[PDB]
Design an enzyme around this catalytic site. Structure first.
Site, PDB file in Angstrom:
ATOM      1  N   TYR A 171       0.776  -1.203   0.000  1.00 37.45           N
ATOM      2  CA  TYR A 171       0.000   0.000   0.000  1.00 37.45           C
ATOM      3  C   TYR A 171       0.824   1.278   0.000  1.00 37.45           C
ATOM      4  CZ  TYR A 171      -3.983  -3.096   1.044  1.00 37.45           C
ATOM      5  OH  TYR A 171      -4.900  -4.113   0.986  1.00 37.45           O
ATOM      6  N   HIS A 208      -4.043   6.473  -1.396  1.00 40.57           N
ATOM      7  CA  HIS A 208      -4.640   6.528  -0.053  1.00 40.57           C
ATOM      8  C   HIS A 208      -3.619   6.684   1.064  1.00 40.57           C
ATOM      9  CE1 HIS A 208      -8.738   6.346   1.526  1.00 40.57           C
ATOM     10  NE2 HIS A 208      -8.673   5.110   1.948  1.00 40.57           N
ATOM     11  N   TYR A 256      -4.887  -0.190   9.596  1.00 36.17           N
ATOM     12  CA  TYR A 256      -5.607  -0.084   8.333  1.00 36.17           C
ATOM     13  C   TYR A 256      -6.491   1.163   8.378  1.00 36.17           C
ATOM     14  CZ  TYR A 256      -3.512  -4.436   6.937  1.00 36.17           C
ATOM     15  OH  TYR A 256      -2.601  -5.364   6.632  1.00 36.17           O
ATOM     16  N   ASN A 271      -9.549   2.192   7.636  1.00 37.96           N
ATOM     17  CA  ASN A 271     -10.909   2.328   8.178  1.00 37.96           C
ATOM     18  C   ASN A 271     -10.983   2.087   9.651  1.00 37.96           C
ATOM     19  OD1 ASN A 271     -10.870  -0.288   8.405  1.00 37.96           O
ATOM     20  ND2 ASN A 271     -12.505  -0.610   7.045  1.00 37.96           N
ATOM     21  N   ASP A 281      -5.334  11.986   1.857  1.00 38.17           N
ATOM     22  CA  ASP A 281      -5.701  12.095   0.467  1.00 38.17           C
ATOM     23  C   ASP A 281      -7.133  12.665   0.324  1.00 38.17           C
ATOM     24  OD1 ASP A 281      -6.186   9.419   1.705  1.00 38.17           O
ATOM     25  OD2 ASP A 281      -7.258   8.966  -0.192  1.00 38.17           O
ATOM     26  N   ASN A 288     -12.690   7.129   4.349  1.00 33.36           N
ATOM     27  CA  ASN A 288     -12.956   6.092   5.328  1.00 33.36           C
ATOM     28  C   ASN A 288     -12.056   6.150   6.557  1.00 33.36           C
ATOM     29  OD1 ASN A 288     -11.565   2.847   3.877  1.00 33.36           O
ATOM     30  ND2 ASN A 288     -10.777   4.946   3.773  1.00 33.36           N
TER      31      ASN A 288
HETATM   32 CL   LIG Z   1      -8.708   1.527   2.668  1.00 36.36          CL
END
Ligand SMILES: [Cl-]
Ligand SMILES: [Cl-]
Ligand SMILES: [Cl-]
Ligand code: NA
Ligand code: NA
Length: 196
Positions: A20, A25, A71, A73, A98, A119
């Site tokens: 990631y 994000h 993570y 969320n 972001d 989120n």
């Molecule tokens: Cl996410």
């Protein structure tokens, strides 16, 4: 604890893991990791707060940095207890993230408001309320509501990445204003950025 609208806690939002790290994000992680290098703030493992964190001097001010490792969320599961334990009021918090509603190379400082669909912010506002500051790092529009995951979890093309990187660099140069409590001036100077 914190002290008025001097920014004392800077949070970067993102997802953990190498898969990631280059995705849109993770724009907030990019900002905070670059800020930490600029000022020589060590980002170390912070298991108690489910994150990576640091503390150091930025322009004569004691500032804490936080990257949730939850993570995206679940970001509130780091930010909220961290801020509670250190007695940092929302008004002294800057959250870099972001922003789908702005172009790559656009960057804005906002105070208050909702999550705008984000989120990570959605996991934070319920607990600390909306009155923290945000560094909204444009990542461009996703197209359809159906393309939104694939957009934010995508690695931007090089031209868009360059535009984001230049906006992030500009914001790094204005953190001095923020830690000094000069939020209006910072807003004017951040929001005026153009890439070209
Ligand atoms: Cl996410
Ligand atoms: Cl804004
Ligand atoms: Cl925001
Ligand atoms: Na990217
Ligand atoms: Na000001």
């Amino acid at each position: 604890g914190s002290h008025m609208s001097n920014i004392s806690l800077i949070v970067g939002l993102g997802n953990p893991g190498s898969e990631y790290a280059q995705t849109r994000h993770n724009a907030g992680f990019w900002f905070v990791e670059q800020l930490a290098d600029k000022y020589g703030i060590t980002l170390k493992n912070d298991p108690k707060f489910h994150g990576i964190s640091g503390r150091g001097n930025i322009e004569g001010h004691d500032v804490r940095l936080l990257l949730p490792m939850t993570y995206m969320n679940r970001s509130g599961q780091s930010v909220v207890p961290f801020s509670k334990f250190y007695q940092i009021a929302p008004e002294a918090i800057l959250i870099a993230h972001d922003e789908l509603d702005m172009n790559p190379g656009v960057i804005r400082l906002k105070t208050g408001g909702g999550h705008g669909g984000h989120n990570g912010l959605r996991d934070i506002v319920p607990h600390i309320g909306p009155n923290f500051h945000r560094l909204r790092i444009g990542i461009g529009h996703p197209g359809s509501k159906e393309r939104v995951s694939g957009h934010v979890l995508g690695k931007a093309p090089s031209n868009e990445q360059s535009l984001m990187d230049g906006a992030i660099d500009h914001a790094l140069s204005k953190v001095k204003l923020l830690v000094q409590g000069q939020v209006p001036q910072a807003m004017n100077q951040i929001n005026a950025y153009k890439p070209a």
